[PDB]
Nucleic acid binder design. Structure first.
Ligand SMILES: [Mg+2]
Ligand SMILES: [Mg+2]
Ligand SMILES: [Mg+2]
Ligand SMILES: [Mg+2]
Ligand SMILES: [Mg+2]
Ligand SMILES: [Mg+2]
Ligand SMILES: [Mg+2]
Ligand SMILES: [Mg+2]
Ligand SMILES: [Mg+2]
Ligand SMILES: [Mg+2]
Ligand SMILES: [Mg+2]
Ligand SMILES: [Mg+2]
Ligand SMILES: [Mg+2]
Ligand SMILES: [Mg+2]
Ligand SMILES: [Mg+2]
Ligand SMILES: [Mg+2]
Ligand SMILES: [Mg+2]
Ligand SMILES: [Mg+2]
Ligand SMILES: [Mg+2]
Ligand SMILES: [Mg+2]
Ligand SMILES: [Mg+2]
Ligand SMILES: [Mg+2]
Ligand SMILES: [Mg+2]
Ligand SMILES: [Mg+2]
Ligand SMILES: [Mg+2]
Ligand SMILES: [Mg+2]
Ligand SMILES: [Mg+2]
Ligand SMILES: [Mg+2]
Ligand SMILES: [Mg+2]
Ligand SMILES: [Mg+2]
Ligand SMILES: [Mg+2]
Ligand SMILES: [Mg+2]
Ligand SMILES: [Zn+2]
Lengths: 53, 49, 154, 101, 111, 144, 116
RNA sequence: ACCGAUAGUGAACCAGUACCGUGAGGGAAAGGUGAAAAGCACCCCGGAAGGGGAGUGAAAUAGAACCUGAAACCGUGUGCUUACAAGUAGUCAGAGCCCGUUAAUGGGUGAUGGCGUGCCUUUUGUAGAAUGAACCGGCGAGUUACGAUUUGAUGCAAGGUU
RNA sequence: UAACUUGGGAGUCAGAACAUGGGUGAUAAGGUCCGUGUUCGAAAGGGAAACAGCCCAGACCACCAGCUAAGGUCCCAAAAU
RNA sequence: GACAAUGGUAGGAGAGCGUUCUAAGGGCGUUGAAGCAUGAUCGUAAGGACAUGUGGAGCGCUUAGAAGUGAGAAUGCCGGUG
């Protein structure tokens, strides 16, 4: 099977309505103030839950 | 007469007809040959007589 | 044309089955780099008219000059050496326009050489008169001998 | 107060001071034209022509003698290699109604 | 006041680059930096370098205060395409477009 | 010279009427109500806008048929499922849902356009003699 | 001498595309489909300049019918009465009168009824 | 009254080359900074690439396939508009909103109503579920020579013409 | 208000429906083959729901004017509940 | 001034638009040519101007002459891009 008609710009972009990524789930590190992924060690300062890793 | 004011004698000159240059001329497309058959072909047509 | 363009001997691909348009040579006219259909071909543009019409045309151009008052008859050109400056002065004193056709009876070397470099001045003989030169000129400057020779011929 | 006047094969409802556009009249800009075919006069006193209100008149001043906006008349018949393109600007006269009667 | 930086002919497809640009368009510089650092896509480090270069010339060329800047513009245009091929079955080859991007970041203090 | 009046929402005034179905023939009442809803009875009728009025029909259960339509006029519908034809006779529909009977009869006489849908939404039918629209202050309307 | 294609082609195609301004998608962009639509537009406009006269006469007649029925007269009998009365006001003017001043229209209706 | 970089040689350029074929053989693509190289010292982000300044220059928006830079196509922003609607996508009618021109009985958008089944080819007849075109651009088809005939024009004329 | 003669240039040689006079077929076919006429072909507009060939009627262009044809006048949908 | 005609395929006839080049005349141009882009401009049509931006060196106009003179379709050729 092959496309019977080409896909218009309108239709392609309607389809791509939901094709996107989201901002990461990130919060400011309580230790160093830099952003980090929640539930991950902070790479800037190496801290997690107030302790060094 | 002047070279910047030349004029041929009235009726002595006529523009040639060009076929196959669009529908408005009336000789576009089939170029006055009609449709199909031996006489519509490049180089076609029977020998005179 | 397609014959003259280089290469093109073989059939580029088989007649049927490939999905392409059928083609017979890479040098066919619809191909980039192909042979030209018709187009210019070397030839002459010269043609003839009856001698009586040639003579009538020459007379008509000369009469047109005579009727526009662009005909000046001078006794002679006594030039011993070529001198563009003197010929330019002669034209100014005769009060000639920019475009002058000078007619001598026979080839006059010094007159030709003196007038040769002046824009708008052309020199000819009585035998060499032709419709383009006469018509192009605004004024004709003809010696008495040349005028008599022209009158004899035409 | 309004009147029904007939001009240019049409009928126009007019009030004094109104600008109107009509089929080209044979008059010059700035001239005064007189419409002599009044079918009806309405307002405080109504007059019904049968067909025309006798003696009733409408005067107007000719502001402009113009040509309408260009129309490109184009038609074709598919598969028949047959089409025709023409331009058209319809003449018009613009006037201002001065006086009814 | 505005400062600009451009990375020309990055060998990443514009569709891909713009997925990430859409996240930072119009955000504060520090937040955008964090988004780029913590977003796991191939174009994130490149876009981050463009953003840092724009902030750097905001500071150096225009003596702008970098802590008040926002990503005013972020976009990817198409660069020239590298044309390649992949051999497929039965002697056939099929084209491969290695597309490139021009990545522009403009940071602004809003004044 | 162009001088034709055009109604628009700034100058349209829609009234409310009440019409009594009792003793009336379904189709004839329906055609008149449809005219009212479309605004064909207004000198300012403008086809591209709704110049019509709201209509309340009361006593829908007392609408009447001629001939044997009560038993022989069948309303069919299809569920878009194979074999999904369902039918109900005109008399049974008058018994069980007279409002729907009147509404479908009237709406079938309105154009199948967005505007025709909107105009048909101004119809309110009640099987009994009461309606809940005293707040709209509707006037009685006499047919024909 | 050779005449290369030059600029005339682009000029002509641009005229057609600009005539297609406002159309949907490819129809304001690509010469071939814009040309097709501009052709259809010309044909439609020629047809509709004629259909518009029918449409406005129909509108006027509808409005006159409404006014007449408000005066307890059908459009058909009102027009017959006006004809017999010798009144030549056309449907456009009759509609505009009915909309703008009811007293004048009532007088016209009375003239018609008297004529009948 | 030959071409002007898809033209003209196949080849304006390191071309009978690259490339293809066992071989005979087939056979491309690819021109342009600027007047001058004055071809961007120096600073800044970056490993680099790339960029922002500074400077050269008339111009760098002429910075290296560097004159101009169309279209398809891809983005960013925005005035109007759109989530009860059945669309060959326009046309005619038409409110609302936003603008203000080669100043013209203006421009952009379009709630809603009427009408309306692309184009070409080929056919008795095609919305056709017959053919053809993914799109855009360039290129792409009654010509020339010599004879014949007819018509127009012109010169001369019982002659006309080499 | 044409007609004919002479000369330059053609295209056409697949036709279709409808009505009617006939053959063929089965007083079958949107069949087939002849005669006669119209329309289509090469004809847009109105009617016949949609519908080349049926009914009305032949679009030089513009109008938000009027009268009619076939066909229609309760609503869709113009005009007689 | 009157009043008559003006649907149209194959096809016949006529009048024109535009392109490159040549001749002659007459002009424009670094105080900005051609080309490109935009615009609410003009002509019965093919099409013709004007303004602004870009561009950076050539180009109109009149009369005549000559043609590699006009593309939307050829499962056309080449390039680019979907
Ligand atoms: Mg011609
Ligand atoms: Mg023809
Ligand atoms: Mg064609
Ligand atoms: Mg012929
Ligand atoms: Mg053919
Ligand atoms: Mg034939
Ligand atoms: Mg294929
Ligand atoms: Mg060649
Ligand atoms: Mg293999
Ligand atoms: Mg040339
Ligand atoms: Mg071309
Ligand atoms: Mg009419
Ligand atoms: Mg070459
Ligand atoms: Mg070039
Ligand atoms: Mg080559
Ligand atoms: Mg430059
Ligand atoms: Mg460039
Ligand atoms: Mg909605
Ligand atoms: Mg519509
Ligand atoms: Mg067939
Ligand atoms: Mg097939
Ligand atoms: Mg075939
Ligand atoms: Mg195909
Ligand atoms: Mg193409
Ligand atoms: Mg017959
Ligand atoms: Mg045919
Ligand atoms: Mg009548
Ligand atoms: Mg009605
Ligand atoms: Mg006619
Ligand atoms: Mg001919
Ligand atoms: Mg050509
Ligand atoms: Mg093609
Ligand atoms: Zn931390």
């Amino acid at each position: 099977a092959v496309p019977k008609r080409r896909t218009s710009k309108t239709r392609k972009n309607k389809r791509r309505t939901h094709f996107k990524i989201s901002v990461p789930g990130m919060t400011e590190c309580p230790n160093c103030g830099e952003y980090k992924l929640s539930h991950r060690v902070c790479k800037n300062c190496g801290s997690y839950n107030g302790e060094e890793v | 007469m002047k070279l910047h004011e030349l004029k041929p004698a009235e009726g002595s000159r006529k523009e040639r007809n060009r076929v196959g240059r669009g529908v408005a001329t009336g000789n576009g497309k089939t170029s006055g040959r009609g449709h199909k058959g031996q006489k519509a072909r490049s180089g076609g047509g029977v020998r005179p007589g | 044309n397609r014959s003259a363009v280089s290469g093109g001997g073989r059939k580029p691909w088989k007649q049927k089955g490939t999905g392409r348009a059928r083609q017979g040579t890479i040098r066919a006219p619809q191909w980039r780099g192909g042979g030209i259909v018709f187009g210019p071909t070397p030839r002459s543009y010269a043609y003839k008219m009856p001698k009586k019409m040639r003579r009538l045309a020459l007379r008509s151009a000369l009469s047109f000059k005579a009727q526009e008052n662009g005909l000046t008859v001078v006794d002679a050109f006594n030039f011993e050496a070529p001198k563009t400056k003197e010929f330019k002065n002669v034209l100014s004193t005769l009060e000639q326009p920019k475009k002058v056709l000078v007619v001598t009876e026979n080839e006059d070397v010094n007159v030709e050489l003196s007038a040769r470099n002046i824009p708008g001045v052309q020199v000819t003989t009585a035998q060499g008169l032709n419709v383009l030169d006469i018509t192009n000129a605004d004024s004709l400057v003809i010696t008495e001998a040349a005028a008599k020779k022209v009158e004899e011929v035409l | 107060m309004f009147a029904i006047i007939e001009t240019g094969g049409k009928q126009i409802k007019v009030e004094e001071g109104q600008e109107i556009f009509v089929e080209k009249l044979d008059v010059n800009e700035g001239d005064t034209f007189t419409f002599d075919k009044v079918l009806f006069v309405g307002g405080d006193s109504v007059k019904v022509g049968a067909p025309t209100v006798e003696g009733a008149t409408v005067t107007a001043t000719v502001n402009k003698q113009g040509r309408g906006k260009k129309i490109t008349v184009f038609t074709y018949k598919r598969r028949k290699n047959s089409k025709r393109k023409k331009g058209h600007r319809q003449p018009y006269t613009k006037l201002t109604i001065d006086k009814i009667n | 006041m505005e400062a600009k930086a451009v990375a020309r002919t990055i060998r990443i497809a514009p569709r891909k680059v713009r997925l990430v640009l859409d996240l930072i368009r119009g955000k504060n510089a520090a937040e955008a930096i964090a988004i780029l650092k913590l977003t796991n896509k191939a174009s994130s480090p490149v876009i981050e370098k463009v953003l840092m270069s724009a902030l750097a010339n905001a500071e150096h060329n225009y003596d702008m205060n970098t802590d008040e800047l926002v990503v005013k513009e972020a976009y990817a245009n198409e660069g020239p395409t590298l044309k390649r091929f992949r051999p497929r079955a039965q002697g056939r080859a099929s084209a491969i477009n290695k597309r490139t991007s021009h990545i522009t970041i403009v940071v602004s203090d809003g004044k | 010279m162009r001088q034709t009046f055009m109604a628009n929402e700034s100058n349209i005034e829609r009234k409310w009427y009440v019409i009594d179905a009792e003793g009336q023939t379904l189709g004839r009442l329906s055609s008149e109500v449809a005219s009212i809803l479309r605004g064909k009875n207004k000198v300012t009728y403008t086809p591209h806008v709704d110049t019509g009025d709201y209509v309340i029909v009361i006593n829908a259960s007392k609408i009447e048929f001629t001939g044997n339509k009560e038993t022989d006029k069948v309303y069919y519908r299809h569920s878009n499922h194979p074999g999904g034809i369902k039918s109900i006779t005109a008399g049974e529909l008058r018994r069980t849902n007279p409002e729907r009977l009147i509404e479908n009869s009237i709406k079938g006489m309105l154009p199948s356009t967005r505007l025709g849908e909107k105009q048909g939404k101004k119809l309110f039918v009640y099987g009994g003699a009461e309606h809940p629209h005293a707040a709209q202050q509707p006037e009685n309307y006499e047919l024909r | 001498p050779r005449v290369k294609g030059g600029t005339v082609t682009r000029a002509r195609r641009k005229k057609t595309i600009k005539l297609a301004k406002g159309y949907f998608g490819s129809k304001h962009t690509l010469y071939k489909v814009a040309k097709q639509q501009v052709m259809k537009s010309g044909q439609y406009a020629f047809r509709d300049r004629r259909q518009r006269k029918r449409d406005f006469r129909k509108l006027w007649i509808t409005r006159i019918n409404a006014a007449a029925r408000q005066h307890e007269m059908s459009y058909s009998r009102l027009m017959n009465g006006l004809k017999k009365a010798g009144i030549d006001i056309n449907r456009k003017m009759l509609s505009e009168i009915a909309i703008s001043d009811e007293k004048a229209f009532a007088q016209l209706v009375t003239k018609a009824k008297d004529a009948l």
